[model samples]
Target: MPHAFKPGDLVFAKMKGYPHWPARIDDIADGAVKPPPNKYPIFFFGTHETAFLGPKDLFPYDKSKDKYGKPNKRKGFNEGLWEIQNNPHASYS
Candidate 1:
């Protein structure tokens, strides 16, 4: 598979019931641990629904923050988010 996305590559993520939403790869976490089953995956893009959602459930968006506001530290799943060193052999793309 290709190396983890570069900063400007356009990507798509599955959005639950909705079709895949377009997203830009703003950042990448190499050795990051997968989020818990109940939490959504993390994709720091411009959208109303931003948090830790599953990979199959997340849809990437290829746009800037013009329409959507920056991601905020909100309640609920705030503490569940995490960042770790990049694992070269991890199965995520």
Candidate 2:
């Protein structure tokens, strides 16, 4: 396998259910890890989660060209309004 990435390098990695997140290569094991010789045990920046990935899944992080999307919050307050106030501002009502 190709060894493009090495320890002490910052890279962008893709997880199965995750977005392309920034990660650091803490170690690159030989022919011992589950993913074999190209095993790159990388640590994610925000999450601190680590996973073994291959070179094909690793790339240099381009901060200047980066972009991200959105998600959810404020669940209980919305439920209260929908249940009691007939959702005065909600389209469901």
Candidate 3:
């Protein structure tokens, strides 16, 4: 089956210790690999990190904002988004 997002599509990635950080879809995994079905590679915006996830764990980047175009009021958000708009690749240890 075709994937929901294309490479370069902006989306939010839900990870274990992250707040659905903003990320970009890298590419879809090979369909022949059934063991890891629905796999898609994603790269975080503000950090140099990449992950594999399925559509169920992703949301459109637009959803990260409110109807009025404000950032969501999540406890700790935007570190993975805003700062990197001007500086594409940022790393923090």
Candidate 4:
């Protein structure tokens, strides 16, 4: 998919508004937030942002690295991906 909210997704945790700090979601924790029903959990990385919304807290998140306008949008894929590769020329002859 071009973009979507999934694992390793960078989300913005806000104390006021989103776009504050970008945090990458590491993994989901079970019963971490609590409620025992639809209540979900978010494990992020960056700022205190790693913490998920209160199994009920009012907050904002910018999931797109491109920007919040772009839902689930990401960036630097090509540059980052190509940069880390096993280039034959990169190896010793």
What's the lDDT for candidate 2?
Answer: 0.53
- Of 3 and 4, the candidate ranking higher by TM-score: 3
lDDT of 3 by residue, 1-93 (tens): 545687767777788865667776765357733325578877776564677888887787665534212355654345555743444333332
Taking all chains together, the TM-score of candidate 4 against the true structure is 0.32
1-93 in candidate 4: lDDT tens per residue?
344344544344333443333333344447544423443234333122235453223223432334432223234323222322222112111
Model 2 — TM-score against the truth? 0.54
- TM-scores for all candidates: the values are 0.32, 0.54, 0.59, 0.32
Local accuracy by lDDT, each model: 0.37, 0.53, 0.61, 0.34
Q: Give the root-mean-square deviation of each candidate in angstroms.
A: 10.6, 15.4, 6.2, 11.3
lDDT of 2 by residue, 1-93 (tens): 444676766666677866566556765347644445658777665455578888777766444114421121322322332222232222221
Worst lDDT 10-window in candidate 3: 84-93
Which predicted model would earn the best lDDT? 3
Tell me how far the alpha carbon of residue 82 in candidate 2 is from the true structure, in angstroms, after superposition.
Answer: 37
Residue 91, model 3: lDDT of 36
Best by TM-score: 3
Arranged by lDDT with the best first, the candidates are 3, 2, 1, 4
Model 3 has an lDDT value of: 0.61
The local lDDT score (0 to 100) that residue 58 gets in candidate 4 is: 21
